[PDB]
Each structure stands twice: as structure tokens, then as C-alpha cells.
Design a protein around this ligand. Structure first.
Ligand SMILES: Nc1nc2c(ncn2[C@@H]2O[C@H](COP(=O)(O)OP(=O)(O)OP(=O)(O)O)[C@@H](O)[C@H]2O)c(=O)[nH]1
Ligand SMILES: Nc1nc2c(ncn2[C@@H]2O[C@H](COP(=O)(O)OP(=O)(O)OP(=O)(O)O)[C@@H](O)[C@H]2O)c(=O)[nH]1
Ligand SMILES: Nc1nc2c(ncn2[C@@H]2O[C@H](COP(=O)(O)OP(=O)(O)OP(=O)(O)O)[C@@H](O)[C@H]2O)c(=O)[nH]1
Ligand SMILES: Nc1ncnc2c1ncn2[C@@H]1O[C@H](COP(=O)(O)OP(=O)(O)OP(=O)(O)O)[C@@H](O)[C@H]1O
Ligand SMILES: Nc1ncnc2c1ncn2[C@@H]1O[C@H](COP(=O)(O)OP(=O)(O)OP(=O)(O)O)[C@@H](O)[C@H]1O
Ligand SMILES: Nc1ncnc2c1ncn2[C@@H]1O[C@H](COP(=O)(O)OP(=O)(O)OP(=O)(O)O)[C@@H](O)[C@H]1O
Ligand SMILES: Nc1ccn([C@@H]2O[C@H](COP(=O)(O)OP(=O)(O)OP(=O)(O)O)[C@@H](O)[C@H]2O)c(=O)n1
Ligand SMILES: Nc1ccn([C@@H]2O[C@H](COP(=O)(O)OP(=O)(O)OP(=O)(O)O)[C@@H](O)[C@H]2O)c(=O)n1
Ligand SMILES: Nc1ccn([C@@H]2O[C@H](COP(=O)(O)OP(=O)(O)OP(=O)(O)O)[C@@H](O)[C@H]2O)c(=O)n1
Ligand SMILES: Nc1ccn([C@@H]2O[C@H](COP(=O)(O)OP(=O)(O)OP(=O)(O)O)[C@@H](O)[C@H]2O)c(=O)n1
Ligand SMILES: [Cl-]
Ligand SMILES: [Cl-]
Ligand SMILES: [Cl-]
Ligand SMILES: [Mg+2]
Ligand SMILES: [Mg+2]
Ligand SMILES: [Mg+2]
Ligand SMILES: [Mg+2]
Ligand SMILES: [Mg+2]
Ligand SMILES: [Mg+2]
Ligand SMILES: [Mg+2]
Lengths: 247, 247, 62, 247
């Protein structure tokens, strides 16, 4: 046989490169996944991830309450946090024993897989009673925020898209919903009559995940990296795997 | 009057038979329900049922965490099970006090009503972090598993469809989503422009149920039988009611 | 060892101790107890008996 | 064939009678069990049974503490009962919040299987610090109490032997050990050199049982009767099964 890495007959090498390229491209076909992650960062350094993985389109919607830190199996001042919520839903509406709940997210990162079309991304960032813009009557139910998404890049390849906003102020109390649509450069509408019942099924087949990690380190080591997910850390460092035409 | 059960003028008899047949056929009309059940069997003999009942199409999607046994109002080692989850999401990722959680499902049965079209059934059996096939990039978001569904039969009639798989191994840690579409032998697409907003409404009108029963016996006696639901028990015994052209 | 003594006991943790008393009553006699479970996870799933090589195998009794 | 119950060719009848007789006689062979039960009766009506079943000989030995009522999974005033014990071991030796512990046995019944030789029965009824007769120096380690054992009889057959004594007085605080030897009318000593290592093994193979029942009724219905054990109840009623030469 030819010697490795010196000719076009390194079929092992060509197969490796094809294998990587097929994975990148399959994801971006209409048969592939689109995925979104919402990261809520808490003052204790822990991070709630909510992830959803579906075909065609994908999104996540969470109440203000559901974005609040919840420590499984530990104390959470649960009565006092009920009172906190009443005071967030309406000024002076509760009887809490604290000015600022440490369970409130300090920041939010939204990440989409590279199979999303950035121009289809939509966010509904509502207030604490789930109203997008002060009052329902004058609320557009979403904003198209794709232009604010930064490319997460590794080896020159787009491994994902990130939108990050901090909630460092007392009045940054939010409900949040975000959505995007899987890339489709064809003129085959996946939601046309031919395939629309398959999209309705995708609503039911979408797989969801949530967990609270103790630190950004733990998230990078045990959630992002093992699953070849994209991420952007607090120091602006990109994580992900470059696959297109690479060994 | 004629004597009962000796002539075609037993209108009570004809009405009984029609009543049963109308029920069977109504269910399979486009106006009828389609229903899915997911049964998770635990090592203590208890069973979580999740059921959903909707028009047009129906499905259920659950995280690994949500499929785990939860004993309402009792102790559940809740802190230790948080640690268990961390070690299931990533090898050696947690600090649990046990090798195998008894809260993990030992098996799963999926049952569909006989109004489903078996060829439209789709399952997303993901790993514990909700990825259908090792990595998102190479994951088809579902498998069409209809061919593995056995007919649940009573008196020669198909009363339902069952797919059962055990999870007897340590590495059988899953998230799970399943979907099917109501029979439609017509060329009227329920998702065509004429009726598609009604299908979107069906998403909101779908009625859901979950409960943990203490034993398969309790499930058969108080869930399956009273509601005329189909079921297949551990001894391969079929439950359901035969209605088509029967008194 | 008694049936009770072979049952899993987690030192220093919760063991559903009242419910397992009821479990035992239902194991000693069918329908003899009021337990909140069909099968106790504290029951052994298997048993291995090992003897040192200094045993005479023909004297073993169970 | 001959008609049932009218001739010596009712082999089913002869086999039934033999089956019963073989069971009675096997028990009394040197290959059979000998068994002892100690019942401690508490003021709340509950009963602790300790049973042991062995070949050749059998016995039970329990501390004063171990004979005290213990309610599994409930409160037992455990600290106060530690103090109670100190005051029972020595007058005014503790700091208990009660004059008389309801956990102390009100009575004791000792029952032996009919395979015992009544003349080999021995009891060590000690005081609360486990001394048979006031002081060790003058204590015979046992009394032969066989003459006080009443025959428990059913259908004319001895189904067992019972010795009962109440402990209705404040000073009736006891430790207790009892022993008996399996009938042996032969001149083959089971403890002779030929078979003595088998008797040492019987020490290890003896099967033990203890449980607290809530009432004498529960004991009769769920312990005595199902296992064909002998018993004598508070109204002097005999329980057991007559087997010798009976259908
Ligand atoms: N392309 C390139 N990579 C470099 C260079 N110097 C160091 N590297 C490192 O080598 C890696 C890429 O190496 P290769 O994959 O073998 O080069 P390539 O550009 O992909 O060439 P092909 O294998 O033909 O596709 C990068 O991740 C770089 O960090 C350089 O001068 N050019
Ligand atoms: N069909 C049929 N049923 C039997 C037979 N023997 C016993 N059965 C029982 O009877 C039940 C069906 O009885 P029917 O409903 O009166 O018979 P059928 O075949 O439905 O006849 P129709 O009432 O005219 O529809 C079944 O569930 C059987 O368990 C038999 O030879 N033929
Ligand atoms: N022996 C006997 N039993 C009676 C008499 N009257 C009623 N019985 C009842 O019948 C039962 C015994 O009946 P059997 O076993 O058929 O009589 P038996 O004395 O054992 O005679 P065999 O069967 O030959 O051993 C007892 O439990 C009694 O309660 C009677 O006059 N003599
Ligand atoms: N030293 C180099 N000189 C020239 N080209 C390089 C060099 N290193 C890498 N490249 C190539 O240039 C392209 C971009 O790689 P690069 O590492 O700069 O991008 P990145 O990882 O997305 O961003 P960054 O490394 O700046 O954080 C890749 O094809 C890479 O192989
Ligand atoms: N003994 C019989 N002989 C002939 N036909 C019967 C008999 N019993 C029932 N049938 C008819 O045959 C058809 C099938 O009934 P059957 O009870 O065999 O099916 P099932 O209940 O779905 O399966 P199974 O009883 O084997 O678990 C029905 O129409 C029934 O009325
Ligand atoms: N009515 C009877 N007349 C004569 N013999 C009887 C009668 N009833 C039973 N027997 C026989 O007499 C023997 C003793 O039976 P019996 O029921 O009197 O004893 P037990 O059950 O040990 O004591 P008890 O019934 O007095 O509590 C048995 O062989 C029985 O079959
Ligand atoms: N604003 C508040 C906060 C708390 N409490 C009382 O203090 C108790 C304990 O506080 P809680 O908020 O319940 O927190 P923990 O019990 O410590 O934690 P958790 O409930 O999550 O286990 C509550 O039951 C409540 O009765 C109160 O009077 N009003
Ligand atoms: N791996 C573990 C498991 C438990 N614990 C500690 O033991 C306590 C009790 O165990 P837990 O898991 O909370 O179970 P329970 O309290 O018995 O049951 P539940 O929480 O469901 O009421 C926990 O609060 C936790 O502090 C721990 O140190 N680390
Ligand atoms: N069949 C049962 C099971 C439990 N309980 C009640 O629920 C309480 C708590 O359950 P238990 O069996 O005692 O378990 P834990 O307290 O959680 O654990 P442990 O006793 O081992 O500390 C008990 O005290 C008992 O009063 C009951 O009513 N009947
Ligand atoms: N003579 C006694 C009796 C009790 N106590 C105190 O009261 C508490 C509760 O009583 P206890 O005897 O422990 O009974 P319970 O806790 O009610 O029941 P259990 O311990 O069996 O669960 C004890 O911890 C002990 O500190 C005491 O000071 N001295
Ligand atoms: Cl495609
Ligand atoms: Cl229709
Ligand atoms: Cl013998
Ligand atoms: Mg706890
Ligand atoms: Mg609280
Ligand atoms: Mg780089
Ligand atoms: Mg049948
Ligand atoms: Mg308890
Ligand atoms: Mg106490
Ligand atoms: Mg009698």
C-alpha cells in the first residue's frame, strides 16, 4: 500500500474528512436537528441550562418563576421566594425578607446551533407577568434579534450563534421565550401541505433538557465539551468543534 | 311484540350493536381522538403513566429526570438523586451514594389507541442529555418504529398498538418522545390551509394525564379497565373492549 | 440470618422503616400488611455464598 | 374401580392417611426439626414472637433489653427507655419519666414443638442483669421446667408443649434463655463422636425468626395457623393440626 499522508490513496484520511463533512452537512439538511440553549447565570456562579432539540424549528418559553435558581434537594427559602415573586409581579406586592433575591438570573445567554437561520430567530423578552412590551394591547409578540447574534467560531468555522445580555439591574426581572427555524435554502416549504403534519409531529418529538450546574467550569467540562456543543464563556472564549472539510 | 333474540325486530339488539359500532367508528373518524400512553416501570413494581389525548395527532416528550420515579408526599432522596443525574449526564460527574438509582425506569411500554395510523408513529429515544443519536450533528430527530408495534387484540379486534422495550442495563438511561397521527384514509389533508388553524388549536386542547400507580394490578383495575383503554401486561395478556359490530 | 436481617439497611440514611415493617408483614403472610409498594427494593436480588479453600465441599450444608 | 370410602382399595384415602402420618413421624425422627417459640406479651396487646428451628437441639437466649417492646418505624421514647433500663439494672439507677415502662413484657409463653423431649427442657430465667439466681456464685445456670409444660392437644394428639408465666408485678424484670433437645428414644447419641460435628453444624444452620404482631388475633391468623404451629391462647384454646394416623 501507499504510505500514510503522502498520496491520494490514503483512503483512511479521505474517509475521516468525509465523515466530518457529512456530519456538518447532515445537521444543516432538512433531516437534521436545530437546537437552542438558554443559559441563566446566577450570582452564586451556578448556571441553569435549558436545551431543546428538534427538527424544522425549535424554541423555549419560560416564566419568570421558572428561570429562578432552584437548588434540588436543598433549602431554597421557598416561602420567602413566593413573597419575592409577589413583589416582582407588582411593586410592594409582597412581604419578603430581602431586597434582591439571589435566585434571580444575573445574565442570559441564548445559543443556537449552526443549523439555524439567524434571520428567523425571534425573542419574546417579557416583564415578570409575561407581557412583551409594558401592555398586551401595544405588544408585538416578539422581536427579531438575529442581528445581535455573534458567530461562535472555531478554526474559521461557525460552530454556533450567541446572544448575551446581562440583567445586572434591580428592574431586570424577565420572562423569556425564544425561537428559530432550521436553515432551508430550498423552495420546498417544510410547512407546506405536503409536510406540515410532520412539523406538527416535530412539536411532540422535540427533546428537552434542563439542569443546574455549579459553575461555568462544570458546564464547559461536563455539558458543552462532551456533547460537541457550541459555547461562549465569560472571557469571550469560543468552544465547539470544526467539522466542515476537516479531519 | 316479537320475542327477544329470535327475529330482525329485536330493535333493542340492533340498537346495541349500532351503538358499539358507532363508538368504534367515531374514534377513527377525523372528528375523533387519538391517544398515546407511555408507561415507565420501576423496580419497586410501581408504574408511571403519562397519557395524552388529542385530535389529529398526539405525542409526549419527557426528560430523563421527568421519567424518574417520584413518590408524591414521601421521601425521594432528592439531594442524592440530583447527584445521580449529574453522574448519568456525564460519567463520574456526580457525588451520589449509590451505583444504580431505583428511581430509573426498568422498562417502557408505549401504547397507541386504535385510531392511530401505525405508519405515522415516530419515536425519539435520546440519551440522558436529550440527544437522539450520540451527537446532534449526526442525529435524525426520530425513528419510525411502527413495524415493532404489536396489535393488542380482543375478540379478533385491534384494540390498540404496543411497543415495549426493557431498560435492564446500567447504560439504559433515556429521554423519550413519541408521536403518532390519527388515521386519515381520505385525501383531505387535516393540515391543509382549510383546517390547519384547527390543528394548531388541537395542540392547545390536548388533554394530558400522569400518575404513579403502585402495581401493575392497580393500573389494570383502576386505570386501564374503567376507561376502556388497551393494555398489554407482563404476562402478555391483552386488555381492552371489542366494539366493532358487537353487542 | 433472618429474612429481615438480609434486607438492605442504609446506615445513617432514611430506610422507609415504618413502611418496611409493613412490607415484612405482607411477606410473612400474603396480604398481611399495609405497605405502600409492591416490591421492596431492600429485598436481595441475588445471593453468593463463598467458602475458603480450607472447607471440605462435601460438608457444606444450606 | 371401587367406590370411594367403601373399601380397602381407596388408595387415595390410604395415601392421604400415610402422608399425614409420615409428616408427624418424620418430625420426630433424628432427621427432623425441633422448634421453640418464646412469646412476650405487652400491655398494648401486641406480642413479640422469637422462634428458632433446628435439628438435634434448639434454644433462644435474650437480654432484658431485647425482650422489651420495640415498635419498628415509630417512636419508642428511646432515650427515656435507656434511663428505664438503668433503673431496672439497679434500684434508683436512672432518671426515667415513668414508674413502669409499657415496653416491659406482661407475660411469657414458651412453646416447644412435639418433637422435643419434655424432660430435656431447661430454662434460665435471670434477673435484669442476666444472673439466674440472685448472684452468679450460687446460681445453677438453669432449671429443668418440663413438669410445668402443659400438652397442647388437638383431636387427642399432642401438637406441642406450653409453659406460661405472667409477669404482672413491678419486680418481674427478666432475662430469659430456654433450651430443649429433640426426642431420641434410640441409644445412638447424636452428640457421640460419629455425629458431633453435625451437631456443631446444626448450631450454625438453625433458622431464627422474630416479629412483633399487634394482637393475639393477628398472631393466631397470620403466624400460628398458616404454618401449622401449636399455640395456646389467653382463653386456654388450643391451636394446631393433628396428623398421626389421620386424614
Ligand atoms: N492552515 C494553516 N494552519 C496552520 C499554519 N500554521 C499552523 N497551523 C495549524 O494547523 C492547523 C491546520 O492544519 P491543516 O489542517 O493540516 O492545514 P489545512 O489548512 O487544513 O490544509 P488541508 O489539510 O489540506 O485542508 C490549524 O488549526 C493551525 O492552528 C499555517 O500556516 N496554515
Ligand atoms: N363465533 C363463535 N363464538 C363462540 C363459539 N363458541 C364459543 N363462542 C364464544 O361466543 C362469543 C361470540 O358469540 P356471538 O357474538 O353470539 O357470535 P358471533 O360470531 O359474534 O355472531 P353474531 O352475533 O351474529 O355477530 C365469543 O367471544 C366466544 O368466546 C363459536 O363456535 N363461534
Ligand atoms: N371418633 C369419633 N369421632 C366423632 C364421633 N362423633 C363425632 N365425631 C367427629 O368426627 C371426627 C373423627 O371422625 P373419623 O376420623 O372419621 O373417626 P375416627 O375415630 O378417626 O375413625 P378412623 O377414620 O377409622 O380413624 C372427630 O374430630 C369428631 O369431632 C364419634 O362418636 N367418634
Ligand atoms: N498560523 C496560521 N497561519 C495561516 N493560517 C492559519 C494559521 N492557523 C490557522 N490557520 C487557518 O486559518 C483558518 C482560521 O483559523 P483560526 O484559528 O484563525 O480561526 P478561529 O479558531 O475561528 O479564531 P481564533 O483562533 O482567532 O480564536 C483555518 O483554516 C486555519 O487552518
Ligand atoms: N370457540 C370458537 N370457535 C370459533 N370461533 C370463535 C370461538 N371463540 C371465538 N370465536 C370467534 O373468533 C373471533 C376471534 O375471537 P378470539 O377470542 O379467538 O380472539 P382474541 O380474543 O383477539 O385472541 P385470544 O382469545 O386468542 O387471546 C371472534 O369473532 C370470536 O367471536
Ligand atoms: N363425640 C365423640 N365421641 C367419641 N369420640 C370422639 C368424639 N369426638 C371425637 N372423638 C374422638 O376422641 C379423640 C379425642 O378427640 P377430642 O376432640 O375429644 O380431643 P381434643 O381436640 O385434643 O380436646 P378437646 O376437643 O376436648 O378440646 C379423637 O380420636 C376423636 O376422633
Ligand atoms: N417572608 C417570609 C419568609 C419566611 N417566613 C417563614 O419562615 C419559614 C422558613 O422559611 P422558608 O421561606 O420556608 O425557607 P426554608 O424552610 O429555610 O427553605 P425551604 O422552604 O426551601 O426548604 C417559612 O415556612 C415561613 O413560615 C415568613 O414568615 N415570611
Ligand atoms: N450524595 C448525597 C446524598 C445526601 N446527602 C445529604 O443527606 C441529606 C438527606 O438526604 P436527601 O438526598 O435530601 O434525601 P431525604 O431528605 O431523605 O429525602 P427527600 O429530600 O426527598 O425528602 C441531604 O439533604 C444532603 O444534605 C449528601 O451529603 N450527599
Ligand atoms: N405504610 C406506611 C408507610 C409510612 N407511613 C407513615 O409515613 C411516615 C414516614 O415513613 P417511614 O416509613 O417512617 O420512612 P422515613 O421516615 O422516610 O425513613 P426512616 O423511618 O427510615 O428514617 C411513617 O412514620 C409512617 O407514620 C404510613 O402511614 N404507612
Ligand atoms: N428521661 C428523659 C426522657 C427524655 N428526655 C429528652 O426528651 C427527648 C425526646 O424523648 P425520647 O426518649 O428520645 O423519645 P422520642 O424522641 O419521642 O422517641 P424516639 O427516640 O424513640 O424516636 C430525648 O431526646 C431526651 O433528650 C430527657 O430529657 N430525659
Ligand atoms: Cl434536505
Ligand atoms: Cl371524518
Ligand atoms: Cl432417625
Ligand atoms: Mg432531603
Ligand atoms: Mg420552608
Ligand atoms: Mg483558532
Ligand atoms: Mg379471546
Ligand atoms: Mg420514619
Ligand atoms: Mg428520641
Ligand atoms: Mg377436639
Amino acid at each position: 500500500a501507499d504510505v500514510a499522508g503522502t498520496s491520494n490513496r490514503d483512503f483512511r484520511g479521505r474517509e475521516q474528512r468525509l465523515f466530518n463533512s457529512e456530519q456538518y452537512n447532515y445537521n444543516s439538511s432538512l433531516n437534521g436537528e436545530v437546537s437552542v440553549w438558554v443559559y441563566a447565570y446566577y450570582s452564586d456562579g451556578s448556571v441553569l441550562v435549558i436545551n431543546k432539540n428538534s427538527q424544522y424549528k425549535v424554541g423555549i418559553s419560560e416564566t419568570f418563576k421558572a428561570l429562578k435558581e432552584y437548588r434540588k434537594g436543598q433549602h431554597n427559602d421557598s416561602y420567602d421566594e413566593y413573597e419575592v415573586n409577589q413583589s416582582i409581579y407588582y411593586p410592594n406586592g409582597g412581604d419578603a425578607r430581602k431586597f434582591h433575591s439571589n435566585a434571580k438570573p444575573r445574565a442570559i445567554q441564548i445559543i443556537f446551533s449552526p443549523s439555524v437561520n439567524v434571520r428567523t430567530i425571534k425573542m419574546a423578552k417579557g416583564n415578570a407577568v409575561s407581557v412583551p412590551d409594558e401592555y398586551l394591547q401595544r405588544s408585538h409578540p416578539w422581536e427579531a434579534t438575529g442581528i445581535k447574534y455573534r458567530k461562535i467560531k472555531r478554526d474559521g468555522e461557525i460552530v454556533g450563534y450567541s446572544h448575551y445580555f446581562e440583567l445586572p439591574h434591580e428592574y431586570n426581572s424577565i420572562s423569556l421565550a425564544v425561537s428559530g427555524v432550521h436553515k432551508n435554502p430550498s423552495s420546498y416549504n417544510v410547512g407546506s401541505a405536503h409536510n406540515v403534519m410532520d412539523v406538527f409531529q416535530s412539536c411532540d418529538l422535540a427533546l428537552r433538557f434542563c439542569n443546574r450546574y455549579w459553575a461555568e467550569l462544570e458546564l464547559v467540562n461536563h455539558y458543552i465539551s462532551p456533547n460537541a456543543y457550541p459555547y461562549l464563556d465569560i472571557n469571550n472564549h469560543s468552544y465547539g468543534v470544526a467539522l466542515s472539510n476537516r479531519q
